[PDB]
Amino acid sequence: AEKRKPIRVLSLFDGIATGLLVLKDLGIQVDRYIASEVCEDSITVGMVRHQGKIMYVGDVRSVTQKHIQEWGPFDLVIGGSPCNDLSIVNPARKGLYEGTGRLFFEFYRLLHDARPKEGDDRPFFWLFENVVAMGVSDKRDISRFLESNPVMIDAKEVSAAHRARYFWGNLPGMNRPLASTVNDKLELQECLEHGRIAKFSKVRTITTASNSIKQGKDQHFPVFMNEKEDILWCTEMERVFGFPVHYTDVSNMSRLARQRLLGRSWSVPVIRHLFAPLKEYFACV
Amino acid sequence: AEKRKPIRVLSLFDGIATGLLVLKDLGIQVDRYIASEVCEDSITVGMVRHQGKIMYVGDVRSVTQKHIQEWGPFDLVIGGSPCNDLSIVNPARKGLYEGTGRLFFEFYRLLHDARPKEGDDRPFFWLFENVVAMGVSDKRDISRFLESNPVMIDAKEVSAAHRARYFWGNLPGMNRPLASTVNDKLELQECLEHGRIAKFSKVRTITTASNSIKQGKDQHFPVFMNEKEDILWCTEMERVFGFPVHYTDVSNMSRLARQRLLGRSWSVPVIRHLFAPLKEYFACV
Amino acid sequence: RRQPVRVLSLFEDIKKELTSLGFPGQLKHVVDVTDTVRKDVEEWGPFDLVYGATPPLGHDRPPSWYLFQFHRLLQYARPKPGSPRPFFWMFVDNLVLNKEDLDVASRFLEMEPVTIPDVLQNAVRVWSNIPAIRSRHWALVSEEELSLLAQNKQSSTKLVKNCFLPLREYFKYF
Amino acid sequence: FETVPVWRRQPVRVLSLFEDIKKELTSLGFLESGSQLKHVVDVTDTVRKDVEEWGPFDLVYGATPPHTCDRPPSWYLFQFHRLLQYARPKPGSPRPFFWMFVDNLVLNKEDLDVASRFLEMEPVTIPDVGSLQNAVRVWSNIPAIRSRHWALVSEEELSLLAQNKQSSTKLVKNCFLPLREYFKYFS
DNA sequence: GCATGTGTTCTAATTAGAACGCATG
DNA sequence: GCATGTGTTCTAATTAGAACGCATG
Numbered sequence A, B: 001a002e003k004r005k006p007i008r009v010l011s012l013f014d015g016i017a018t019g020l021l022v023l024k025d026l027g028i029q030v031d032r033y034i035a036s037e038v039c040e041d042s043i044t045v046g047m048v049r050h051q052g053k054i055m056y057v058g059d060v061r062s063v064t065q066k067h068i069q070e071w072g073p074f075d076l077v078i079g080g081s082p083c084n085d086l087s088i089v090n091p092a093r094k095g096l097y098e099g100t101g102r103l104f105f106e107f108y109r110l111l112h113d114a115r116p117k118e119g120d121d122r123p124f125f126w127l128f129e130n131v132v133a134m135g136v137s138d139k140r141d142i143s144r145f146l147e148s149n150p151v152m153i154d155a156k157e158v159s160a161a162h163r164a165r166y167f168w169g170n171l172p173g174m175n176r177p178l179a180s181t182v183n184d185k186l187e188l189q190e191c192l193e194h195g196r197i198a199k200f201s202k203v204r205t206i207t208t209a210s211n212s213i214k215q216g217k218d219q220h221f222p223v224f225m226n227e228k229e230d231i232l233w234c235t236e237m238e239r240v241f242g243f244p245v246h247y248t249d250v251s252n253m254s255r256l257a258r259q260r261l262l263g264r265s266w267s268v269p270v271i272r273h274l275f276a277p278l279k280e281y282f283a284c285v
Numbered sequence C: 001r002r003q004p005v006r007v008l009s010l011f012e013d014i015k016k017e018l019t020s021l022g023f024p025g026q027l028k029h030v031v032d033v034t035d036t037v038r039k040d041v042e043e044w045g046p047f048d049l050v051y052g053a054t055p056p057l058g059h060d061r062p063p064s065w066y067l068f069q070f071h072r073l074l075q076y077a078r079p080k081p082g083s084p085r086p087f088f089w090m091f092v093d094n095l096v097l098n099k100e101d102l103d104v105a106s107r108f109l110e111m112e113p114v115t116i117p118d119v120l121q122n123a124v125r126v127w128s129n130i131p132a133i134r135s136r137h138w139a140l141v142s143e144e145e146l147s148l149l150a151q152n153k154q155s156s157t158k159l160v161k162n163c164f165l166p167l168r169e170y171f172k173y174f
Numbered sequence D: 001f002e003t004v005p006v007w008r009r010q011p012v013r014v015l016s017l018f019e020d021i022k023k024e025l026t027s028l029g030f031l032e033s034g035s036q037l038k039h040v041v042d043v044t045d046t047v048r049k050d051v052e053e054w055g056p057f058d059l060v061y062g063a064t065p066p067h068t069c070d071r072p073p074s075w076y077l078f079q080f081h082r083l084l085q086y087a088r089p090k091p092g093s094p095r096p097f098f099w100m101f102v103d104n105l106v107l108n109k110e111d112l113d114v115a116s117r118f119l120e121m122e123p124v125t126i127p128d129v130g131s132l133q134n135a136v137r138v139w140s141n142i143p144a145i146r147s148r149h150w151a152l153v154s155e156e157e158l159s160l161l162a163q164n165k166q167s168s169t170k171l172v173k174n175c176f177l178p179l180r181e182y183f184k185y186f187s
Numbered sequence E, F: 001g002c003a004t005g006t007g008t009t010c011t012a013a014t015t016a017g018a019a020c021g022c023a024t025g
């Protein structure tokens, strides 16, 4: 019996390298991790937090079919496109076919370019992520181009924050019930620094809008510290998202710059739940 | 004298609790650590990074004789008064008797109040720190009021940055030469994150100025990254000063707020050297 | 002695050009391809020509929609990797797509567009795998004129049908 | 703190800082007509060994200048406190130990707060004397000064005194009065 | 049901950058 | 000599906060 070989990943719209982070937590060997990203803040985090393992390739629109063949074969193809023109939180959203919603089709093209041809029964896994708060047509259109329906997973059941997301893909057992682990921080109190009191169990969805860190329409402060009320700290937002502490503390970034990266990123425990069955297919530490 | 006992410390102008950090690092058992601090950011760091061990008392001018007597007896009295009116880098400095310069006398008063009575044999140590770039008359008066001559200790010998500081005190072997330990990072290169290259061996004195991080009269950038110049990151400044990484990463503080705290604090290895022989005089857990 | 051709027609009706050019039902046409899964195109028999085109200048949907839906159904109607016979596809634009949409078109269809002119009056952009669509040293026309041609048309086909011409040798017969 | 019989009393040794009170203490009879009182003005280089050498003291006097001060107003207090702690006797010391700091309205509210913080007590307003003519603020460990019911002076009426005097006695010299029952009287 | 949102924009408070500053080892 | 400096105060550029918005599950 032939032994399992390290996984080969193409990560589109990588962000702060959550995919690589999760794979390394699962102890999965990764031979190559080729990621497409434009934001300087995102790429800088990736280089530092992973010691330059990631081969950064640039704009997703610069990635050709031959490049996919030349860099391949890819065992895993993950991606999470901008939802600034998809989410119904933006009254100025330009839909799926205009603005940045169009970037979704780049994941669509490259996914088709990365798949094995006929007569190739080799394992090929992929995952696409976006919000549930989008347009009905757009949700349908995404399902039509990917030829699949999304699994809905709220990070509310695995973290201390609401985050209902859609997940398209063929990962083994995407639909299976979510189980809590020993190191799953479900309560807000678990994510706070010492001497700080949590007012709520869960917090609402964290966005790039800085005031999304305040709960309710009344904009309540989430945390009480020392005779005054306070918002979540950057270190606490990281723990809420399931990221390592001080993960985004690079390149002199402010609170807003860090919440911008975290705001658009994945919930680590959710991705871990989805990537966990990949351990059965590839080499491990 | 049955055995060694945990040290009782009075820290005036505590800042980011460099003293307690060092006492902890030396394994010295601490009975109490009473800090007089007024800055909100500073106090927050000390509360978080030391788990509310520190007993904060507020303004130093609010600390009375009765307070010292009740809170004590103190084994160690350390302090580093503001130099923003003492350092010659400030063209509008007010001197030792005006502005924040007069806060030095508050240390002089509390030192006098904390000292043991006549005929008392018990060990009592004190340490006072301030800059070298002060007036020749201000340096004179400080020595006169403290009845001692200071020891000039530059952090460049034990860290990766120039920091010529005067140290008044009575600690065992303050005059002995500085020996670089295995843990000390002596060059800027060792303090940088991955993928970063140092343009200089040692950086110049880091003040609260945003461009004290730049070098020379030409204002050169300290590091190289991706064939493009850059300044030091907050995490890197903490390595240069000798602090733990992300020690100041609290309360959503910006780069300025973080550098403002680091700029005014002590070089950790310098304090580690000075506090080193105190582990003989006190209980070490 | 070469068999005739199953044509899949997208968005615009070429039942006139293919019948007047002499190219009973061998042609399939769909107008709203929104709910067209893979099985639908598969059930409509094999295809030797998959045609799609943007609506005439001044017709009601985001210009990239036609380009994206074309690429989707085109990948549905491809034969086995071991080619059983001749397969051809072509996407026709009528100066609707802007500069960005042309970059998207070229990238998704993995080849540069051929500019098809008329004397200067009506213009057409063509993406096609036909070795004879490209072979024709097509009459050169400047882009600026093409932009002005659309600007003078806001105020309000032939040799493109001869683009069907070189498809005769592969097919039959009339 | 207690009063001792007349014959056991001794001539007071006085450390008079910034301002000589050799004329005030003589007219009251604390020093003989023949030359006991050390008057130092340039205490900037005065160390602890100097004061100890300069002989034990019973009364360490302090006062801010009325005029032009070469040094900041707070400089006089800080230096006074420094030397006072130098001249303090051993805990088992016998004779009366006294100290005094006098202000001629030249210390601001912030500097007044600092003074009372370092000397661990609030000052005493001594007026003299029918409109008010002169007044001084006094810090001392002398019982009678912080006990007598002096005339109450409004702060809004003291800043007026600092206005016309900056535009430029007997009862004021009664701060040394209650020191007669502790040391030798000469007449 | 209805209230929740991988967003964008605008406003005052802060930031990051740079000029200014001259006595001192 | 002559660079240096536990700072302060100018900008133009961001930060941090709040308002806005309404379709979707």
Ligand SMILES: Nc1ncnc2c1ncn2[C@@H]1O[C@H](CSCC[C@H](N)C(=O)O)[C@@H](O)[C@H]1O
Residues within 6 Å of the ligand: A012, A013, A014, A015, A016, A017, A018, A019, A036, A037, A038, A039, A042, A058, A059, A060, A061, A079, A080, A081, A082, A103, A261, A264, A265, A266
């Ligand atoms: N044209 C483009 N090419 C590549 N990446 C792009 C892009 N336009 C936007 N992006 C990136 O797509 C990302 C979408 S948010 C997804 C981030 C990711 N899920 C994470 O875990 O961090 C953003 O970080 C943005 O920088």
Ligand SMILES: Nc1ncnc2c1ncn2[C@@H]1O[C@H](CSCC[C@H](N)C(=O)O)[C@@H](O)[C@H]1O
Residues within 6 Å of the ligand: B012, B013, B014, B015, B016, B017, B018, B019, B036, B037, B038, B039, B042, B058, B059, B060, B061, B079, B080, B081, B082, B083, B103, B264, B265, B266
């Ligand atoms: N009135 C006061 N009472 C107590 N601390 C004060 C004060 N005025 C200023 N300070 C503090 O004195 C410090 C001067 S620099 C002190 C730094 C400290 N030795 C360290 O290693 O971190 C500043 O933190 C400032 O907040």
